[PDB]
Amino acid sequence: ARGPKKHLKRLAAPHHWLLDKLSGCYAPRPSAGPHKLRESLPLIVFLRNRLKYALNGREVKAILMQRHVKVDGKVRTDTTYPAGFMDVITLDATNENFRLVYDVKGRFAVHRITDEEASYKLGKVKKVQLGKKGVPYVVTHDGRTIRYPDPNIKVNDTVKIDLASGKITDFIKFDAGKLVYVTGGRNLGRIGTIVHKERHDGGFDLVHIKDSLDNTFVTRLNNVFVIGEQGKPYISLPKGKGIKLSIAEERDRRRAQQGL
Amino acid sequence: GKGKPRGLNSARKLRVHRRNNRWAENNYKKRLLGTAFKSSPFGGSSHAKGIVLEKLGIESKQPNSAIRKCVRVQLIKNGKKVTAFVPNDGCLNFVDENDEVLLAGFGRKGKAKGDIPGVRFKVVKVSGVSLLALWKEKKEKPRS
Amino acid sequence: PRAPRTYSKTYSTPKRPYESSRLDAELKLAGEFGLKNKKEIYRISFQLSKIRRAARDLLTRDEKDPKRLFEGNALIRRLVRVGVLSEDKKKLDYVLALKVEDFLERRLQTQVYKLGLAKSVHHARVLITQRHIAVGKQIVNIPSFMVRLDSEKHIDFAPTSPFGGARPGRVARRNAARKAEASGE
Amino acid sequence: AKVHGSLARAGKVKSQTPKVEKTEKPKKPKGRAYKRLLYTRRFVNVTLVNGKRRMNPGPSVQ
Amino acid sequence: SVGFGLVYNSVAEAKKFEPTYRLVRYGLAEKVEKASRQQRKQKKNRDKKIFGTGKRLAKKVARRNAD
RNA sequence: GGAUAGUGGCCUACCAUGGUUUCAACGGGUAACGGGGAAUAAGGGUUCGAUUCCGGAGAGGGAGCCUGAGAAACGGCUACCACAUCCAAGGAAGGCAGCAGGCGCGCAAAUUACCCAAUCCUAAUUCAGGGAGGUAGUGACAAUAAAUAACGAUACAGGGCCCAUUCGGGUCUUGUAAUUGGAAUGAGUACAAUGUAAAUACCUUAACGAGGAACAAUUGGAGGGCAAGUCUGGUGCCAGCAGCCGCGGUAAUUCCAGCUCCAAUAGCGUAUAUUAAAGUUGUUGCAGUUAAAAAGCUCGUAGUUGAACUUUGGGCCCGGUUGGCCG
RNA sequence: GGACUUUUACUUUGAAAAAAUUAGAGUGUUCAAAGCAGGCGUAUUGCUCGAAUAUAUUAGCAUGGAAUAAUAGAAUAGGACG
Ligand SMILES: [Mg+2]
Ligand SMILES: [Mg+2]
Ligand SMILES: [Mg+2]
Ligand SMILES: [Mg+2]
Ligand SMILES: [Mg+2]
Ligand SMILES: [Mg+2]
Ligand SMILES: [Mg+2]
Ligand SMILES: [Mg+2]
Ligand SMILES: [Mg+2]
Ligand SMILES: [Mg+2]
Ligand SMILES: [Mg+2]
Ligand SMILES: [Mg+2]
Ligand SMILES: [Mg+2]
Ligand SMILES: [Mg+2]
Ligand SMILES: [Mg+2]
Ligand SMILES: [Mg+2]
Ligand SMILES: [Mg+2]
Ligand SMILES: [Mg+2]
Ligand SMILES: [Mg+2]
Ligand SMILES: [Mg+2]
Ligand SMILES: [Mg+2]
Ligand SMILES: [Mg+2]
Ligand SMILES: [Mg+2]
Ligand SMILES: [Mg+2]
Ligand SMILES: [Mg+2]
Ligand SMILES: [Mg+2]
Ligand SMILES: [Mg+2]
Ligand SMILES: [Mg+2]
Ligand SMILES: [Mg+2]
Ligand SMILES: [Mg+2]
Ligand SMILES: [Mg+2]
Ligand SMILES: [Mg+2]
Ligand SMILES: [Mg+2]
Ligand SMILES: [Mg+2]
Ligand SMILES: [Mg+2]
Ligand SMILES: [Mg+2]
Ligand SMILES: [Mg+2]
């Protein structure tokens, strides 16, 4: 196409943002950044779509150009910064913090969390590798490289980075029966223990996942994101605890809650 | 039994054999051979307008007897000469020689209608007003 | 390069266009429910067919079928909320027996007639379109409004309009002045 | 087969039919009112019959 | 009549945060009076045929006619 | 080996003779950009997709290259080819398959309008720019909702259930009106507010806005198929009608009209294509003695298709679901 | 306890799967085509459900099955197992 595309037609846009069909021709289109543009969430979406603090688009740069918002600690002013999974986003001028942790449909929950926790976040290691000058380094999913890590951490292990200082502080291995988040695929939004990793030499290992309500299911190796010991999360989980309820069951929970 | 192969592995034969046979189907072959675009006096288009060369009084087929009023038109878009029937009482006096008229099919898909021989078309407009409107005197033919 | 504001045709005309016994049957309905044209019967005719088709489909499925069960009782739930399906005809077999007037009766047309207000469907018509009616605060001026059960007992006259209170119409409020302009001064 | 026939008499009959103008008359009810009119007439009133009923039987059998 | 409205934690703080088409409805900010789009544009394009100040070039233009 | 960002006959030198094909190569045609999808509703299918999203290609035709991370870029350059503008005749300059608009083409397709308010993009950038995009104009493409009238009054007629001895007939309820009277309303026109970037329309709302020369619905049709005239006047195998069968030759149910009637109705007709009907392409699912159709005969390769048998039967454990039942 | 079909077809179940469109749940755009909204209250500085689900009929990948249909194998034993 002769080079980099810069627009985004308002339908090719990631569905989980829940933009509306009309309103205009276009969607925000993520900037280049820490997360893959289809797996991301523009700040502009968050502030005006998810948070409803803004109306215009102008009134978002309004907020952003005020440093009212910081992502993973740092002040980010880009209208369309590719904020994504495990991220924090902190609105100081209204003392609230969030965490971009998935819904159970597959969307980005407005899962508000404390000022504790906000000082850390998880990070699946994508590659761990020996850099130049004999130095080693891990590469988390969010586009962080942390040099000098524990020789114990291999790929698909998660890592508790700080947030103000880099630095890995504790880490979880990937093995039989750990608390797992699903980051994409059909089962996006789910949460549970493992049981089996089906190895397929050549490509695409598969992870059978059990939830607290005993519902086995499968995904691909990269879809899986370890987050703690069984029943013991390493972070706050949104409402519904990533369980996936059938639309039958779903019907009740709503109409039965209604009335009183 | 049946005279057609029934093997689970015979698709090719059953497939080509019908593809082979769609040809005896007229409407299909007309479509595939593009008769429409080639031999048909219109492009395949639903209408054509040409210029009126002369007026004709084609006599009817048996067992009828009348002088069906028509016109030899020469189609602008491809210079073809074909003749077209001019419907309704004395409308033939609405069209003149050299008069530029819109023709349409006779609604037979190419065949001749009724007892009017050689005529596969009809005059629908003339000097761009509508023959229908003229015959009912609600519109008037602009001067030549 | 926007996005299509999608659309749909609401009715469908019959195949054979000159059945006398259908045209008799059709004309009848037009007169007792106060209809303007055949299209108002077609629109409903069409409606029913999608219901019967949706119905007859779920029935081919084995029961206990999470789709059948979900998407069946849902249909039934909607059909009852309007008064097309009876309070204990709640079975898919029974939605299949739904005939055209079942819907036609629930017409806000035929409801301004039924519970007083009109004493004529062809009075009920002009009553509605001339905004002389309301479900609560809301003036509903569409004859094919389809009155649901809970709303049935709320179809009182308009908060404006003479027939409902506050002021008379301009033809009233003009005679009242014309009997003053001449007979007085 | 024969293509030049007489064009001389093109428009005979439309030009020698005596021009008689349509009678003035009350209007029919354009709209729902018409169908209503048609209902109450076609089978509420029910005019002349025979074993079929008849829509346009001008000057009858007698 | 359902509508939408908002209340700012000041007067002139509302003034830097409100779209200037609102402020003019109020009399708050003033109504800016500029030339029509095509008029605006046609100027830009006119101005583009010029390298330098032009304040220089109008000498070139005029030097030729005054001899 | 060269070359490329790199793989590779990508190119070169040398060496072999290999590579594809009836399981249809190669060649031809396409009124062929591919897909998402669209029309057609028993199923199976049939037909379509230039066109809102994705991918591709191209910027009059070809080739070549500068710059750059990215172009073989065309609102970049260079040449040839085809066009073609200005000229003081020496020279100079252009590329709308961007938005408008013009010509041509044809059956066939709208304003040289307003704006960055929204959606989003770009930049050194909260500001600038955006015919991206939005707004309005033209717009019976297609789709949705649905006014063109409503309720009385009375005089006959009566559905009149009767009383009942008779033009003696109760009391509502249909229908007929050159008969009547009070109500209702938005189509409009318009204060205002609302809407808007500014206007406009929508919604809301004062002042007005109904009785038939209106606020006056049309388009087809009335022999059959096929719903609805054997009424009238005109024509006389003429004019004309008729998808098809057929109507017309002086009593025309079919032409030309008046009357009335039918069907659909803010819409109806016509032409062309296409789908259903078509079990008239048949996998489901056709037909082949005589209606179209078994090669004169046999062999035979490709293709399709090909008898039967190999753990059968017995006996345990385990927790599952629809009906007995009754609260 | 983990890999395991002689080699296939077949079939079951999944995974990796854009939106719109389609099927379709919820929602009183006043109805409807739509849209993805909205719903509640002290409505004087708030509360709150959502934006599901099905889809896909080839091929590839993963998996439960072995009836049906192919196919391989010890015969001059250059047989099998330890
Ligand atoms: Mg961006
Ligand atoms: Mg000739
Ligand atoms: Mg300048
Ligand atoms: Mg190379
Ligand atoms: Mg080589
Ligand atoms: Mg050779
Ligand atoms: Mg195509
Ligand atoms: Mg082409
Ligand atoms: Mg296409
Ligand atoms: Mg195609
Ligand atoms: Mg084309
Ligand atoms: Mg290009
Ligand atoms: Mg051109
Ligand atoms: Mg550049
Ligand atoms: Mg370009
Ligand atoms: Mg180029
Ligand atoms: Mg250009
Ligand atoms: Mg143009
Ligand atoms: Mg011009
Ligand atoms: Mg024309
Ligand atoms: Mg057009
Ligand atoms: Mg803008
Ligand atoms: Mg700007
Ligand atoms: Mg400044
Ligand atoms: Mg009118
Ligand atoms: Mg009137
Ligand atoms: Mg008529
Ligand atoms: Mg009939
Ligand atoms: Mg006669
Ligand atoms: Mg006829
Ligand atoms: Mg007649
Ligand atoms: Mg046959
Ligand atoms: Mg024969
Ligand atoms: Mg023979
Ligand atoms: Mg066998
Ligand atoms: Mg993928
Ligand atoms: Mg298998």
SS (H, E, C) D25-43: CCCCCCCHHHHHHHHHHHH
How far apart are the C-alpha atoms of A199 and A206, rounded to whole Å? Answer: 7
Which residues from chain B sit within 8 angstroms of residue D2, using beta carbons? Answer: 58-59
In our burial notation (b when 16+ CB lie closer than 10 A, e otherwise), range A213-230 reads: eeeebebebbbbbbbbee
Which helix (H) or strand (E) element contains residue D14? helix D12-16
What distance lies between CA A95 and its chain's CA centroid? Answer: 22
Task: Please name every residue paired with C95 in a beta bridge, in sequence order, or none if there are none.
Answer: none
**Partner residue facing D39 (CB), from C31, C37, C125:** C31
φ/ψ of A240, rounded to 5, equals 80, -15
- Long-range CB pairs of C74-82, under 8 A, 24+ apart, other chains included: C75/C51, C79/C51, C80/C149, C81/C148, C81/C149, C81/C150, C82/C106, C82/C146, C82/C147, C82/C148, C82/C149
Token pair of A134 as six digits: 């004999």
Tokens 């519109």, residue located:
B139
Which nucleotide lies closest to B69 by the C1' atom and the CA atom? F240
- Residue C136 structure tokens: 């609560």
Q: A253 CB contacts (<8 Å, ≥6 apart)?
A: A245
Longest Cα–Cα distance in chain A: 67
DSSP classification of residue A94: G
E63 to chain A, closest Cα gap in Å:
48
Number of Cβ within 10 Å of residue A180's Cβ equals 26
CA distance A216 to A187: 11
Three-state SS string across chain C, please?
Answer: CCCCCCCCCCCCCCCCCCCHHHHHHHHHHHHHCCCCCCHHHHHHHHHHHHHHHHHHHHHHCCCCCHHHHHHHHHHHHHHHHHCCCCCCCCCHHHHCCCCHHHHHHCCHHHHHHHCCCCCCHHHHHHHHHCCCCCECCECCCCCCCCCCHHHHHHCCCCCCCHHHCCCCCCCHHHHHHHHHHCCCC
Q: Which residue has the tokens 């130095």?
A: A135
Enumerate the residues of chain B whose CB falls inside 8 A of the CB of residue D22.
none
Which bases of chain G are under 7 A from a protein CB atom?
A: 3, 14-26, 28, 30-37, 45, 49-54, 61-63
Q: After which residues is chain D broken (C to N over 2.5 A)?
A: none
Model resolution, angstroms:
3.2
A126 CA to chain C: closest CA distance, Å? 38
Q: Which two tokens stand for residue B39?
A: 């031999």
Residues 126-145 of C with CB under 7 A from strand G: 135, 138-142, 144-145
Cα(A231)–Cα(A177) distance, integer angstroms: 10
Hey, CA dihedral for C58, C59, C60, C65, is it positive or negative? positive
Question: How many angstroms separate the Cα of C98 from the Cα of each of C29, C53, C104, C114, D40?
Answer: 16, 12, 11, 21, 27
Contact between A208 and A70 under an 8 Å Cβ cutoff? The reply is no
How far apart are alpha carbons A168 and A130 in whole angstroms?
17
Separation of A202 CA and F16 C1' (Å)? 37
Touch between D and B (at least 3 CB pairs under 8 Å): yes
HSE-up (13 A, CA, CB side) for residue C104: 21
Resolved by: X-ray
How far is residue A170 from each of residues A103, A117, A149, A194, C149, measured CA to CA in Å?
26, 14, 10, 20, 62
Q: Chain E residues with CB inside 8 Å of A54's CB? A: none
Residue E19 touches partner A, C-beta closer than 8 Å = yes
Yes or no, beta carbons of B55 and D11 under 8 Å apart: no
Please enumerate residues of D whose Cβ is less than 8 A from a Cβ of B: 1-7, 9-15
**Could you tell me the two tokens for C82?**
């309007």
Residue in the block written with tokens 């769609």? B22
Q: Please tell me whether the peptide bond between D59 and the residue prior to it is cis, using omega within 30 degrees of 0.
A: no
Q: Are A80 and A30 in contact (CB under 8 A)?
A: yes
CA of C141, C1' of F187: distance in angstroms: 16
With beta carbons under 8 A apart, name residues in chain C contacting A19: none
Q: Is residue A100 a contact partner of residue A107, using CB atoms and an 8 Å limit?
A: no
List the single protein residue with the shortest CA to C1' distance from F142. Answer: C7
Distance CA A111, CA A51 (A): 11
Torsion of CA E33, E38, E40, E44, to 10 degrees: 180
